[PDB]
Amino acid sequence: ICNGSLYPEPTLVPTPPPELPTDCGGPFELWEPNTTFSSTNFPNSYPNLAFCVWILNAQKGKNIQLHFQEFDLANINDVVEIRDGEEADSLLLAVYTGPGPVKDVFSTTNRMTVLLITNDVLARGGFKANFTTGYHLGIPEPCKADHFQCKNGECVPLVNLCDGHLHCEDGSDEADCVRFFNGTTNNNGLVRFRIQSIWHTACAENWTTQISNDVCQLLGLGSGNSSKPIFPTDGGPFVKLNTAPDGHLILTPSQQCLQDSLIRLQCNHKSCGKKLAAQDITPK
Amino acid sequence: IVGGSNAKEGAWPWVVGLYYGGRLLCGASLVSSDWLVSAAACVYGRNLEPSKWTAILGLHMKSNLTSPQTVPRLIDEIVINPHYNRRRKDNAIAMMHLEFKVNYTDYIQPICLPEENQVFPPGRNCSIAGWGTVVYQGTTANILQEADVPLLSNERCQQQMPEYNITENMICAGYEEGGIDSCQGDAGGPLMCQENNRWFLAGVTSFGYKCALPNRPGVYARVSRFTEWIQSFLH
Ligand SMILES: *[C@@H]1O[C@H](CO)[C@@H](O[C@@H]2O[C@H](CO)[C@@H](O[C@@H]3O[C@H](CO)[C@@H](O)[C@H](O[C@H]4O[C@H](CO)[C@@H](O)[C@H](O)[C@@H]4O)[C@@H]3O)[C@H](O)[C@H]2NC(C)=O)[C@H](O)[C@H]1NC(C)=O
Ligand SMILES: *[C@@H]1O[C@H](CO)[C@@H](O[C@@H]2O[C@H](CO)[C@@H](O[C@@H]3O[C@H](CO)[C@@H](O)[C@H](O[C@H]4O[C@H](CO)[C@@H](O)[C@H](O)[C@@H]4O)[C@@H]3O)[C@H](O)[C@H]2NC(C)=O)[C@H](O)[C@H]1NC(C)=O
Ligand SMILES: *[C@@H]1O[C@H](CO)[C@@H](O[C@@H]2O[C@H](CO)[C@@H](O[C@@H]3O[C@H](CO[C@H]4O[C@H](CO)[C@@H](O)[C@H](O)[C@@H]4O)[C@@H](O)[C@H](O)[C@@H]3O)[C@H](O)[C@H]2NC(C)=O)[C@H](O)[C@H]1NC(C)=O
Ligand SMILES: *[C@@H]1O[C@H](CO)[C@@H](O[C@@H]2O[C@H](CO)[C@@H](O[C@@H]3O[C@H](CO[C@H]4O[C@H](CO)[C@@H](O)[C@H](O)[C@@H]4O)[C@@H](O)[C@H](O)[C@@H]3O)[C@H](O)[C@H]2NC(C)=O)[C@H](O)[C@H]1NC(C)=O
Ligand SMILES: *[C@@H]1O[C@H](CO)[C@@H](O[C@@H]2O[C@H](CO)[C@@H](O[C@@H]3O[C@H](CO)[C@@H](O)[C@H](O)[C@@H]3O)[C@H](O)[C@H]2NC(C)=O)[C@H](O)[C@H]1NC(C)=O
Numbered sequence: 124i125c126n127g128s129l130y131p132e133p134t135l136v137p138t139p140p141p142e143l144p145t146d147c148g149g150p151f152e153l154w155e156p157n158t159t160f161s162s163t164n165f166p167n168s169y170p171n172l173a174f175c176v177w178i179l180n181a182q183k184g185k186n187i188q189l190h191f192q193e194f195d196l197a198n199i200n201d202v203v204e205i206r207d208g209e210e211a212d213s214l215l216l217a218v219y220t221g222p223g224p225v226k227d228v229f230s231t232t233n234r235m236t237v238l239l240i241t242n243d244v245l246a247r248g249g250f251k252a253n254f255t256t257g258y259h260l261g262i263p264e265p266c267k268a269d270h271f272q273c274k275n276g277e278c279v280p281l282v283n284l285c286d287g288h289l290h291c292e293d294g295s296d297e298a299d300c301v302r303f304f305n306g307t308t309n310n311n312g313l314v315r316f317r318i319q320s321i322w323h324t325a326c327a328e329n330w331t332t333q334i335s336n337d338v339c340q341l342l343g344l345g346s347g348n349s350s351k352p353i354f355p356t357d358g359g360p361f362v363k364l365n366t367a368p369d370g371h372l373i374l375t376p377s378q379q380c381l382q383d384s385l386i387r388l389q390c391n392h393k394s395c396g397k398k399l400a401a402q403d404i405t406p407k
Numbered sequence: 408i409v410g411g412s413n414a415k416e417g418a419w420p421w422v423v424g425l426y427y428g429g430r431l432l433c434g435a436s437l438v439s440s441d442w443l444v445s446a447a448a449c450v451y452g453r454n455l456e457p458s459k460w461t462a463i464l465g466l467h468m469k470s471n472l473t474s475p476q477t478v479p480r481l482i483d484e485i486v487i488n489p490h491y492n493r494r495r496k497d498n499a500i501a502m503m504h505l506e507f508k509v510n511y512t513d514y515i516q517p518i519c520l521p522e523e524n525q526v527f528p529p530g531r532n533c534s535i536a537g538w539g540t541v542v543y544q545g546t547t548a549n550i551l552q553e554a555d556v557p558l559l560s561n562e563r564c565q566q567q568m569p570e571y572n573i574t575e576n577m578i579c580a581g582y583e584e585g586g587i588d589s590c591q592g593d594a595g596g597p598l599m600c601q602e603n604n605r606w607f608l609a610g611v612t613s614f615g616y617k618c619a620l621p622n623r624p625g626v627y628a629r630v631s632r633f634t635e636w637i638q639s640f641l642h
């Protein structure tokens with residue numbers, strides 16, 4: 124029977140565990156005069172497992188632009204979240220992480236929220252930024268004198284809207300001038316072409332299957348199914364669609380057509396989840 | 408994934424893998440010629456350098472990457488759904504742009520998308536796939552694993568997992584007896600249902616409490632509520 128151990132065997136002095144990370148919060152919602160602010164200890168480092176919320180406030184009708192003078196954070200473990208509304212719904216818009224310079228962020232409303240997410244290891248110096256606000260900083264002014272603005276803001280008088288080819292360096296004219304109008308579903312509708320700004324059909328003087336399939340392909344759908352007009356109701360500047368030796372379509376406007384009608388096309392769906400596995404069929 | 412069975416050649420041509428750092432980290436699905444759909448939760452901090460992301464097409468076997476049946480690809484642009492919070496794990500869907508156009512073959516096929524007013528009723532078997540861990544402790548470096556799970560109503564999903572609001576933006580699929588799950592390792596796997604003999608895309612794998620835990624199924628995000636956003640730039 125072991126006995127006589129009348130000594131303090133646990134000679135080691137216990138130490139409190141590094142628990143309770145919680146958060147430091149840091150600066151909160153501020154107006155325009157407040158521009159420059161450190162996260163919590165930006166010149167030196169930031170605490171691990173710290174969550175902070177920075178809200179940028181601007182006058183109604185204005186937007187907010189970011190400019191990170193110094194941005195040196197950890198790896199993909201730590202990220203920075205950007206929000207605009209923070210009332211009922213917010214959009215990420217831009218998320219920044221990792222060391223190195225980052226691009227500017229333009230708010231879509233008169234409010235911006237900045238969030239910090241940190242891990243428990245690899246703490247870096249931090250980041251800082253300031254804002255100046257303004258009127259449509261990220262939205263270029265549309266050009267007057269009948270100029271059409273693209274997605275990225277480039278404005279041209281008329282070199283787009285379904286021409287022979289896109290005369291735009293940006294080339295953001297993804298939307299076409301042919302869409303299904305007055306239809307019943309996504310795949311069913313009336314053919315409506317637009318030369319410049321006016322929607323019109325393509326008549327049925329020489330309508331064939333090849334041009335129907337070409338139109339269906341231009342609509343992002345499959346082959347032509349159930350190609351038959353019913354009755355005419357439009358009265359716009361109707362054009363003529365005719366077969367061509369090449370793969371392009373030619374629209375010739377003419378309001379003196381005979382037996383005008385609106386053509387209803389039901390284009391089939393495109394390629395879908397059709398399995399092509401080669402397996403034996405069990406005769407059961 | 409967990410408790411699944413080995414797939415056949417060409418069984419899931421619309422499932423593709425995403426490689427970052429040299430190892431598979433998240434799954435994705437092929438929709439258009441140069442776009443993919445993947446869970447936004449996994450690709451959150453790695454979207455600033457798409458050049459380091461490698462897109463693998465037809466990764467039926469993880470041991471063959473340079474095989475002729477596998478077409479390597481690179482990621483050019485990564486788009487994350489704006490309405491993402493990482494706090495409620497809501498709208499965890501992301502779209503990735505392929506650098507070059509991808510041809511369609513027998514083993515590489517696109518997938519359908521839900522249409523308007525197209526809701527799958529609860530109680531229907533739906534297929535899942537992924538290269539994640541099948542035993543919750545080990546690793547998966549073998550053939551693609553496939554499984555089928557039934558759709559569960561969100562009313563029971565909230566009760567069985569009293570941790571999130573769930574709401575109507577999530578769809579839960581699994582078995583009350585447990586043993587089948589796909590929320591470990593590869594969280595980018597798609598939720599696939601069968602509407603007619605054409606197949607459809609139902610959801611994308613999302614956060615899951617624990618695999619094979621009794622009455623603890625996974626969570627999926629309804630693509631039917633993101634169809635407009637996907638088609639806005641599907642082209
Ligand atoms: C698209 O498809 C529809 C069928 O779904 C097709 O039918 C047209 O529908 C519109 C309404 O959507 C009809 O317009 C009405 O016509 C009656 C006829 O007398 C008018 O009295 C109505 O006048 C009302 O609206 C005016 C303007 O808002 C008001 O000023 C007025 O006080 C009345 O409140 C109304 O205009 C239309 O008659 C039918 N039929 C036809 C042949 O248009 C429609 O034609 C299709 N579209 C195209 C471009 O073909
Ligand atoms: C993905 O699939 C596409 C096909 O949809 C494929 O495009 C092909 O690219 C090659 C190389 O750029 C094109 O070149 C052909 O090469 C053969 C070799 O003998 C020639 O015979 C071809 O000439 C015929 O085809 C021309 C049309 O391209 C005709 O104008 C000509 O008169 C001849 O009939 C041609 O030079 C080939 O044409 C395309 N295929 C097409 C356009 O259908 C692409 O390479 C695939 N990508 C990958 C990564 O596999
Ligand atoms: C961001 O911008 C802020 C706004 O410009 C800056 O905060 C302001 O800093 C000035 C510095 O002088 C403070 O001026 C003082 O204001 C107090 C106000 O009275 C206080 O006491 C009453 C009770 O009697 C209390 O009700 C008030 O709320 C105040 O707490 C004066 O008494 C002083 O004499 C002096 O003028 C501003 O008060 C202060 N604003 C606010 C809202 O506190 C800030 O420094 C900028 N930077 C950062 C990092 O925030
Ligand atoms: C993943 O990559 C692996 C490469 O490391 C693939 O392994 C190869 O798989 C093929 C089948 O797809 C095997 O080919 C078989 O070869 C045997 C015998 O080899 C004969 O080869 C020639 C004819 O080509 C003949 O002249 C010789 O005398 C041999 O008799 C054949 O009987 C089979 O029918 C089949 O053709 C390779 O042997 C095999 N290589 C290795 C190193 O294992 C693997 O298949 C890939 N994964 C998938 C799913 O395909
Ligand atoms: C946050 O505050 C800083 C304060 O420095 C603002 O920096 C500003 O940056 C612009 C560059 O975009 C500076 O203009 C520069 O002027 C020099 C003059 O020689 C010229 O050589 C450069 O090519 C450039 O045009 C500007 O001077 C500078 N501000 C000050 C006071 O020096 C920054 O813009 C602020 N952030 C935001 C979002 O406004």
Ligand SMILES: *[C@@H]1O[C@H](CO)[C@@H](O[C@@H]2O[C@H](CO)[C@@H](O[C@@H]3O[C@H](CO)[C@@H](O)[C@H](O)[C@@H]3O)[C@H](O)[C@H]2NC(C)=O)[C@H](O)[C@H]1NC(C)=O
Nearest residue numbers: 326327328329330331363364365366367368373375381382
């Ligand atoms: C669209 O369909 C109409 C159907 O009326 C086509 O109208 C006529 O089509 C003929 C095709 O042979 C055109 O050629 C003419 O043939 C007669 C045959 O004897 C010949 O004598 C004429 O000298 C002429 O070559 C004809 O010009 C045309 N128009 C008429 C008869 O007024 C129309 O051609 C079709 N559209 C296209 C682009 O094919």
Ligand SMILES: *[C@@H]1O[C@H](CO)[C@@H](O[C@@H]2O[C@H](CO)[C@@H](O[C@@H]3O[C@H](CO)[C@@H](O)[C@H](O)[C@@H]3O)[C@H](O)[C@H]2NC(C)=O)[C@H](O)[C@H]1NC(C)=O
Nearest residue numbers: 412530531532533534535553554555556557558582584587
């Ligand atoms: C697709 O959904 C059907 C629902 O009809 C599933 O079929 C059911 O599968 C379970 C096992 O997962 C069967 O439970 C056991 O089946 C054995 C053999 O019949 C029986 O002796 C046991 O008492 C127990 O019921 C069940 O019978 C079977 N059928 C029904 C009507 O529930 C099926 O598993 C789902 N998945 C696939 C890939 O088909």
Ligand SMILES: *[C@@H]1O[C@H](CO)[C@@H](O[C@@H]2O[C@H](CO)[C@@H](O[C@@H]3O[C@H](CO)[C@@H](O)[C@H](O)[C@@H]3O)[C@H](O)[C@H]2NC(C)=O)[C@H](O)[C@H]1NC(C)=O
Nearest residue numbers: 391392393394395396397398519601602603604605606607
């Ligand atoms: C959507 O699902 C329906 C079933 O609800 C599919 O229709 C089925 O199509 C197959 C293929 O032709 C039919 O098989 C054939 O049946 C006839 C007898 O009707 C037989 O003589 C042939 O040898 C062949 O076996 C099947 O009967 C038919 N089922 C129906 C109409 O109820 C339809 O194909 C599916 N859609 C797509 C796009 O796959």
Ligand SMILES: *[C@@H]1O[C@H](CO)[C@@H](O[C@@H]2O[C@H](CO[C@@H]3O[C@H](CO)[C@@H](O)[C@H](O)[C@@H]3O)[C@@H](O)[C@H](O)[C@H]2NC(C)=O)[C@H](O)[C@H]1NC(C)=O
Nearest residue numbers: 310332345346347348349350388389390391392603604605
């Ligand atoms: C246009 O789209 C419709 C979609 O409803 C296609 O309709 C298909 O119709 C068939 C019905 O044909 C069958 O023929 C069997 C004998 O071969 C007969 O036993 C059976 O009872 C039935 O009459 C149906 O099976 C398909 O499911 C329908 N859908 C599809 C996608 O095929 C129609 O064929 C399409 N037309 C064109 C030209 O594309």
Ligand SMILES: *[C@@H]1O[C@H](CO[C@@H]2O[C@H](CO)[C@@H](O[C@@H]3O[C@H](CO)[C@@H](O)[C@H](O)[C@@H]3O)[C@H](O)[C@H]2NC(C)=O)[C@@H](O)[C@H](O)[C@H]1NC(C)=O
Nearest residue numbers: 210211212492493494495496497565570571572573574575
């Ligand atoms: C998970 O959902 C939580 C829901 O709790 C309640 O949600 C309602 C929705 O608007 C809040 O407003 C109420 O709306 C009622 C009508 O539907 C009114 O009768 C009521 O007076 C009130 O205006 C309500 O404040 C809120 N709380 C309570 C105690 O009712 C929500 O609170 C959580 O934030 C959400 N979790 C998230 C978003 O992560």
